[PDB]
Ligand binder design. Structure first.
Ligand SMILES: [Zn+2]
Lengths: 250, 73, 75
């Protein structure tokens, strides 16, 4: 059972091979220069700092290793500086239509420097983003071939969203209150997720604690902080023991 | 008064009472007051264009019930 | 001899430059540094769908008067 030297997945899987790029796709710098992605009336002063990477939407997206395999992003490859590239169709940052139309097709984008979750403002959707050396992108819909991979990751992402939004909001609440909140949160309209339960949290406890900590740390200017609220102390304790020990306490 | 809407990328809709009088920097303060989002991190967009802190609503032709898009830096 | 061109950034700024068609890409980036403060090594210039190589000239890429180049930064 031979594995890819880069992405570590099993090679004897025809489904793994990334297909063709989106039609007439271009490289990342050329893509980013397309007028359809400009939200500026350009003037001799500029609107943003040069220190600030442009940010766009990306739809019909696929992520692959340098040997051409469709690849998940949550298994630690990016963090190990394994190069994951992507393709898809970039769209204006405000655009909420995940269709290919109005997009700029890009190929061999990246590699991805880091990925992240954001959008903890109480809206329906979680936001997943990629950073490259040239731009940031907010994901829309996966390509048909990449959809199964991206789908596998959605449960842990929305448990995290629930938790972050609950903790930022409710600085003196209990584990019991969090479970109640989780149980009463309706999964997102666009997906087919099961209801969330306490065991949902327990199974993803380590990932959830990491997202809280990353949320706090990214706040250079703690606007809605969490840190060590009581509920969070309980979550940290849970995340530091095995799943069986978490469940024993339930 | 006048009523405008603001979409975040999550689909969250913020409703605001404003007047063609305010600056964009004011609109951001109203957004800050109600959502706790620092104006420094706010980019507002209408008709496909990023708006400038110094200019006023009236100047960008924003009719009643119109929707702005909020993107965070 | 000199020629005016434009450098459109991804920040909503358009830069304007006087260059000679014998100038290298490397020279243009140097001018961009002087005027905008951008280290040349973070600079990528694009014309007609192509990424421009430091050693060639504007003439090599048939860049003409009032051509627009695109500046993309890797930071
Ligand atoms: Zn691979």
């Amino acid at each position: 059972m031979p594995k890819c030297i880069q992405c570590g997945q099993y090679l004897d899987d025809p489904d793994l091979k990334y297909g063709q790029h989106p039609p007439d796709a271009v490289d990342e710098p050329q893509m980013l220069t397309n007028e359809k992605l400009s939200i500026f009336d350009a003037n001799e002063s500029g609107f943003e700092s040069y220190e600030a990477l442009p940010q766009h939407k990306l739809t019909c997206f696929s992520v692959y290793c340098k040997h051409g395999h469709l690849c998940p992003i949550d298994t630690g490859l990016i963090e190990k500086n394994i190069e994951l590239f992507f393709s898809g169709s970039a769209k204006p940052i405000y655009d909420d239509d995940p269709s290919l139309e109005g997009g700029v097709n890009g190929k061999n984008l990246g590699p991805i420097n880091e990925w992240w979750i954001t959008g903890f403002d109480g809206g329906e959707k979680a936001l997943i983003g990629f950073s490259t050396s040239f731009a940031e992108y907010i994901l829309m819909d996966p390509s048909p071939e990449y959809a199964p991979i991206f789908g596998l990751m959605q449960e842990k992402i929305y448990i995290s969203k629930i938790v972050v939004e609950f903790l930022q909001s409710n600085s003196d609440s209990t584990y019991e209150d969090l479970i109640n909140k989780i149980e009463t949160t309706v999964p997102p309209s666009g997906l087919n997720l099961n209801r969330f339960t306490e065991d949902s949290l327990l199974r993803h406890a380590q990932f959830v604690v990491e997202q809280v900590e990353s949320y706090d740390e990214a706040g250079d200017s703690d606007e809605q902080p969490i840190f060590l609220t009581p509920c969070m102390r309980d979550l940290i304790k849970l995340a530091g023991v095995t799943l069986g020990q978490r469940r024993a306490q339930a | 008064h006048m009523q405008i809407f603001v979409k975040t990328l999550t689909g969250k809709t913020i409703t605001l009472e404003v007047e063609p009088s305010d600056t964009i920097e004011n609109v951001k303060a109203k957004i800050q007051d109600k959502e706790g989002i620092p104006p420094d991190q706010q980019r507002l967009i209408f008709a496909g264009k990023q708006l400038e802190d110094g200019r006023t609503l009236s100047d960008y032709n924003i009719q009643k019930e119109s929707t702005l898009h909020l993107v965070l830096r």
